[PDB]
Amino acid sequence: IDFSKPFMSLGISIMIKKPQKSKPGVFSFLDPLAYEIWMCIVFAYIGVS
Amino acid sequence: TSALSLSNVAGVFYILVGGLGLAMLVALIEFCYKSRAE
Ligand SMILES: CCCCCCCCCCCCCCCC(=O)O
Ligand SMILES: CCCCCCCCCCCCCCCC(=O)O
Ligand SMILES: CCCCCCCCCCCCCCCC(=O)O
Ligand SMILES: CCCCCCCCCCCCCCCC(=O)O
Ligand SMILES: *C(=O)CCCCCCCCCCCCCCC
């Protein structure tokens, strides 16, 4: 058959799952340390006092 | 990068509790000495 001129140029692309904006949590300033450290600091604080 | 675990700062906790035990020992030794004196 004899095609006509392309009316839509395309190709092979890459599709991935759209990511999320990862809205920071309210209490995210605690993230640098683990929950165990934060809990142990309170225990250490009480003990020292 | 993960949040620091207790295993990263475990040694300073041991030093702190050791210091708290040493201070109690030191304090009670003075108390024990003074009590004997008088
Ligand atoms: C003066 C020593 C301690 C007082 C101030 C330190 C603040 C501690 C607050 C941490 C709350 C307990 C952990 C929250 C749980 C989590 O991080 O997911
Ligand atoms: C300045 C006052 C004294 C402070 C330090 C007191 C000693 C506390 C205990 C130190 C850690 C003991 C455990 C060692 C761990 C290991 O190497 O396996
Ligand atoms: C000086 C009076 C007594 C004080 C006792 C405080 C002891 C603090 C240290 C205990 C360490 C025990 C756990 C060791 C962990 C490890 O070796 O990895
Ligand atoms: C981890 C072990 C703890 C042990 C705690 C026991 C403390 C004994 C000291 C209390 C006061 C004793 C006063 C004795 C006075 C004296 O006869 O000189
Ligand atoms: C006078 O010298 C009498 C008292 C002597 C012994 C005192 C013992 C208590 C002080 C040490 C505390 C240790 C705390 C940690 C326990 C694991």
Side-chain angles (χ1 to χ4, degrees), chain A residues 31-34 37 40-41 44 47-48, chain B residues 2-6 9 13 16 20:
Chain A
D31 282 1
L33 302 179
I37 302 184
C40 285
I41 291 166
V48 170
Chain B
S2 48
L4 292 174
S5 47
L6 205 51
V9 290
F13 275 97
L16 180 73
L20 296 182

Side-chain angles (χ1 to χ4, degrees), chain B residues 12-27:
Chain B
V12 66
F13 275 97
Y14 300 146
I15 292 168
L16 180 73
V17 177
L20 296 182
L22 177 64
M24 290 169 68
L25 184 67
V26 164

Side-chain angles (χ1 to χ4, degrees), chain B residues 29-38:
Chain B
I29 287 162
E30 175 177 2
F31 170 75
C32 283
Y33 165 86
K34 292 186 170 304
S35 295
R36 296 164 205 176
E38 71 164 81

Side-chain angles (χ1 to χ4, degrees), chain A residues 3-19 22 24-29:
Chain A
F3 294 100
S4 70
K5 289 292 179 297
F7 61 82
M8 200 172 327
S9 296
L10 72 164
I12 293 167
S13 64
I14 297 167
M15 177 174 70
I16 62 175
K17 178 160 181 156
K18 183 178 179 180
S22 66
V26 163
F27 292 120
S28 61
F29 59 93

